[PDB]
Amino acid sequence: AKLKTRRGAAKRFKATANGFKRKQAFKRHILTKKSAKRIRQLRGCVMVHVSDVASVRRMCPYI
């Protein structure tokens, strides 16, 4: 049978030229107590760590 994508991982990751990009955690709620620096530095996308790239490749084989 064809390999099946893990759709949760597909919804959480996207592919770049040499890796995968992802969003950052701790920005959904409980935001008042956090300082402005954390608020603005937890915004945007970062890269998937090389320790997790292999697992991401196993879970999402077509992206």
Partner 1 sequence: TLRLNELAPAEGAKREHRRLGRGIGSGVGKTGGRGIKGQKSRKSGGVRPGFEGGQTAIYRRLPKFGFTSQIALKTAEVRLSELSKVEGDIVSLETLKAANVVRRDQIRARIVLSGEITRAFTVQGVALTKGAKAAIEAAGGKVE
Partner RNA sequence: CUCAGUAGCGGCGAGCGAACGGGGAUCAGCCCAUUAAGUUAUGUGUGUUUUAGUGGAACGCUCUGGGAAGUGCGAACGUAGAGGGUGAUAUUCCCGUACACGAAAGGGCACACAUAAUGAUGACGAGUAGGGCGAGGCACGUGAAACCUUGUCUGAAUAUGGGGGGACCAUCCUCCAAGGCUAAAUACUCCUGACUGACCGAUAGUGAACCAGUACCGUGAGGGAAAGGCGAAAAGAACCCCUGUGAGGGGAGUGAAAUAGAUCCUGAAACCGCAUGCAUACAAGCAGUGGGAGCACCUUCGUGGUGUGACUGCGUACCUUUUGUAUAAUGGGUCAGCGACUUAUAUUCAGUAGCGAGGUUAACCGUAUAGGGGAGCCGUAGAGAAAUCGAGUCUUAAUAGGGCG
Partner RNA sequence: CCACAAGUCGAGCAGGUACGAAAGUAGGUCUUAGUGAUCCGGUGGUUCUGUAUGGAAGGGCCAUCGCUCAACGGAUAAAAG
- The site for partner 1 (CB under 8 A) is made up of 6, 8-9, 11-14, 22-23, 25, 27-28, 52, 55-56, 58-59
Q: Which amino acid is at 34?
A: K
Task: Report the nearest approach of RNA to the CB of residue 53 (Å).
Answer: 10
Taking the complex as a whole, how short is the minimal distance between the CB of residue 55 and RNA, in angstroms?
A: 10
- As measured in angstroms, the least distance from the Cβ of 33 to partner 1 is 19
Q: Say if residues 48 and 13 touch (Cβ distance below 8 Å).
A: yes
Q: Which two tokens stand for residue 44?
A: 């945007």
